[PDB]
Design a binder for this molecule. Structure first.
Ligand SMILES: Nc1ncnc2c1ncn2[C@@H]1O[C@H](COP(=O)(O)O[C@H]2[C@@H](O)[C@H](n3cnc4c(N)ncnc43)O[C@@H]2CSCC[C@H](N)C(=O)O)[C@@H](O)[C@H]1O
Length: 251
């Protein structure tokens, strides 16, 4: 059985997956997707040529199935109902019988549990710093993202009990997280998007499902994981209402 991999949005894990797939001569297609456009329909041409053809198994790595996948398609993900699963890098390596080296174990740990996941595998201060910078660089974080981050922590950040609430006009939130870490609970929101990081995401999912269908909600990891809403699917008032509901969990 021959392997076809379709890669979704880019980050340090997806970059590492490209490296391993490259070194091992695996058929894979990388349309340089990002976290917000990781659609299976981006690979409609490849689904047409390899879909339902016996010799090939198709591995979609963190792709929303906005089109019906063929019968020879296996979803490779660690989000939503797969949120307790090992990271995509770990699952891809297992399929290829690739032993993850020390660097790649940190890539998987950061992908699944951020900085706590790396401290759990004995990461050093300099190991954590290189992973975080490479992770943000692979996301496309640039200098304008890091400035809006500094302003968001300086001028739009309050703490309610154990919860940081940051209003921002920024596009990428990883710059804010690394400046505020360590934290137990962090809520970043924009006029049409919010992402929660930290303890008790199941209680947050309860709140979100009162305001928007589950198809606008993504999450990953356990408690001390993240849960968020797709950009521009909720109104400003809906976000602001949710922000108050999340704040109410601290009172
Ligand atoms: N507790 C934590 N605190 C801070 N960062 C963490 C934490 N846990 C994990 N992380 C980091 O978060 C990253 C998780 O990576 P992923 O598993 O690929 O998960 C990614 C996406 O794959 C996933 N996602 C699913 N659908 C969508 C969508 N429509 N739009 C945007 N994002 C979507 O949600 C995650 C991004 S969530 C925040 C997105 C934000 N708009 C931004 O630009 O930074 C990874 O780099 C980890 O290091």
């Amino acid at each position: 059985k021959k392997h076809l991999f379709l890669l979704g949005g880019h980050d340090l894990e997806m970059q590492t997956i490209v490296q391993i797939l490259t070194d091992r001569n695996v058929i894979f297609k990388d349309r340089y997707l990002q976290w917000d456009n990781a659609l299976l329909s981006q690979y409609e041409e490849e689904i047409q040529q390899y879909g339902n053809k016996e010799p090939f198994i198709i591995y979609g790595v963190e792709l929303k199935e906005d089109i019906t996948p063929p019968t020879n398609y296996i979803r490779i993900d660690h989000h939503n109902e797969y949120a307790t699963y090992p990271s995509a890098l770990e699952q891809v390596a297992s399929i290829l019988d690739h032993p993850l080296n020390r660097y790649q174990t940190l890539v998987a740990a950061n992908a699944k549990a951020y900085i706590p996941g790396m401290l759990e595998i004995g990461a050093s201060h300099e190991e954590i710093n290189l992973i975080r910078q490479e992770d943000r660089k692979a996301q496309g974080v640039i200098e304008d993202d890091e400035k809006l981050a500094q302003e968001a922590i300086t001028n739009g950040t309050e703490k309610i009990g154990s919860l940081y609430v940051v209003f921002t006009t920024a596009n990428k939130f990883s710059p804010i997280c690394d400046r505020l870490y360590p934290y137990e609970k962090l809520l970043i929101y924009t006029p049409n998007e919010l992402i929660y990081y930290g303890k008790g995401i199941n209680s947050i999912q309860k709140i979100l499902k009162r305001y928007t269908p589950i198809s606008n909600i993504f999450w990953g990891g356990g408690i001390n994981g993240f849960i968020g809403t797709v950009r521009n699917r909720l109104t400003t008032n809906e976000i602001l209402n949710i922000v108050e509901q999340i704040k109410l969990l601290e009172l």
